[PDB]
What we know:
The protein is mainly β. About 0% of the residues lie in helices and about 20% in strands.
Amino acid sequence: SRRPQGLPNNTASWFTALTQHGKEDLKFPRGQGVPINTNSSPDDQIGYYRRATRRIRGGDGKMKDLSPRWYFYYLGTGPEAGLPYGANKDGIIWVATEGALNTPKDHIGTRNPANNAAIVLQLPQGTTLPKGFYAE
């Protein structure tokens, strides 16, 4: 309750967060993945989505769970910057566009939406949206 830490780590999204409206862990087909940025080539299109869960008081027994959301982060950036791409961790998924490099995207950076509006999560055609997840 004293000296609160609003930012747990490098929490800065380039894109919007994708909410979960279904019982899916969020997955993307091979060749598809991280949202495309026309200011970036597919080479740098490699990243991961991190599940965010919040709990708030509502129930009179347990503190009701708040609707979760998933944030996308580029490899080498984000709160899990030191987390390897081929790292097995629950709550994280791996996505990559063909031609992706298993290298960090320090060049892209970890821009924060506070400075400017985040990129509307746009995905290329041929992508499969998991039930409960919609790209918008």
